[PDB]
Amino acid sequence: NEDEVNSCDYWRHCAVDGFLCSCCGGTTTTCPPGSTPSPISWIGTCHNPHDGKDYLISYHDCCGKTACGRCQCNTQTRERPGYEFFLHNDVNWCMANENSTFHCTTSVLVGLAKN
């Protein structure tokens, strides 16, 4: 449901800080045209209500275009400060891209979490 995935409350968006790519001309798992996926990201686990399982989500950014500005989220479930760096979302996960300009952020399902 497009409306549903475009909400900060959608289950897999539980540690998104940035603009949802699905509102920026992309989808939950594809960058808007002309923006580049980040090879690195912060990660978190989000509880899936539909099956009651926790999933590891990789919060990759799309990079190399200026701020999308749509559907800004600042959710912080299980987010931790930078001394747990890959759980931290107050940094630009485009930081190692060929162009680090932050465009939007995605929530990519990796697989089931460890219980």
Binding site: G25, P33, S35, T36, T66, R70, T106
Partner: protein, 361 residues
């Protein structure tokens, strides 16, 4: 389980796309073009355009052209003025074309960044404050001509009936026509007779452009015309947009890209407001008036929704209006425009919207 990928094309067909040039004046170094689907208001993507970008779409619909300025350190360092060619479907950068460091930095009037009818040349306004028109050869990716004859003139009006001719409005109230050769250099030129009194009845630069003629509205609500169907441009006017009741409440035009022409019907669309006086020429539309250019009579008047700029799609009989942030979509197949929808928050500070070209003519 999933992998984030790039390399994707715009999700909606070209025929659904419009381009909202967001100056982002409050943060003008981050101007951009927002691409929207006019049928459902969906945001499709964007092209970053640095400081005070300008944009057009190639006549064949394959490419987006931008014009902008960079500096090595933004507010210091060496300047680079460029045209960029972007793929329209992938919204990716393809080519930079170097310009001399004098491209106009100004609000997004259509006439500052245009192309020849044949699509082979981009034609742009320079102001440094030295004025001239610059010519870019798209095929070669080169700046090829700087039109000195255009000093003291302003803006580019392509002639749709010729492959590589355009006009500009001169400070003496006449028009200069430039005809380019196949190399993009000036092959010939001509000056019209004086069309309007610069002091007494200044025209807005935005043309209501037909295939072989153009109309202009004045600060006081008169209409002037330039017919370029023959070998030389023939000028006329004024006729008034205003009846006696109109004049009594001081109705006058106001806006930026404030007029349009529906070529099949000869209807001209103009943003108008009451209580006109010195200083009101950029006021938001209280109304849109629809004028028959053959009969010289108003055929409709509708609420303006505070619009400032417009554009017309001939093929689908559509008019878009823009109030700086929101885009209104109108069906103009009938004399009374019908509002179809409003796209809210299409921009923060836009004075220009354009349709993706459909067909190639």
């Amino acid at each position: 389980r999933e992998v984030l990928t790039g390399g994707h094309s715009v999700s909606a067909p070209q025929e659904n796309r419009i381009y909202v040039m967001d100056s982002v004046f409050m943060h003008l170094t981050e101007s951009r073009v927002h691409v929207y689907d006019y049928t459902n208001g969906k945001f499709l993507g964007m092209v970053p355009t640095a400081f005070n970008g300008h944009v057009q779409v190639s006549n064949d619909g394959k490419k987006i052209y931008t014009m902008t300025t960079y500096h090595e350190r933004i507010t210091r360092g060496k300047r680079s003025d460029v045209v960029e060619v972007w793929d329209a479907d992938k919204l990716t950068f393809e080519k930079e074309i170097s310009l001399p460091p004098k491209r106009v930095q100004g609000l997004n009037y259509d006439g500052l960044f245009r192309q020849t009818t044949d699509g082979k040349f981009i034609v742009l306004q320079n102001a440094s404050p030295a004025t001239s028109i610059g010519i870019v050869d798209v095929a070669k990716g080169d700046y090829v001509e700087d039109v000195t004859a255009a000093a003291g003139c302003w803006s580019v009006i392509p002639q749709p009936n010729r492959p590589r001719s355009f006009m500009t409005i001169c400070g003496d109230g006449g028009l200069l026509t430039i005809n380019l050769g196949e190399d993009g250099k000036v092959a010939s030129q001509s000056r019209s007779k004086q069309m309007f009194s610069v002091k007494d009845d200044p025209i807005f630069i935005a043309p209501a452009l037909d295939k072989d003629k153009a109309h202009f509205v004045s600060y006081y609500g008169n209409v002037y015309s330039a017919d370029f169907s023959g070998d030389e441009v023939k000028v006329d006017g004024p006729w008034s947009l205003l009846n006696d009741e109109d004049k009594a409440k001081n109705w006058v035009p106001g806006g930026y890209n404030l007029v349009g022409l529906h070529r099949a019907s000869g209807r001209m669309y103009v943003f108008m407001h009451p209580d006109g006086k010195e200083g009101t020429h950029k006021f938001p539309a209280a109304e849109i008036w629809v004028m028959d250019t053959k009969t010289k009579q108003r055929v409709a008047r509708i609420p303006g929704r505070d619009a400032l700029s417009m554009t017309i799609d001939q093929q689908r009989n559509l008019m878009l209006t823009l109030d700086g942030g929101n885009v209104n979509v109108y069906d103009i197949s009938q004399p009374e425009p019908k509002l179809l929808r409003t796209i809210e928050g299409a921009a923060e500070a836009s004075l220009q919207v354009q349709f993706h070209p459909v067909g190639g003519t």
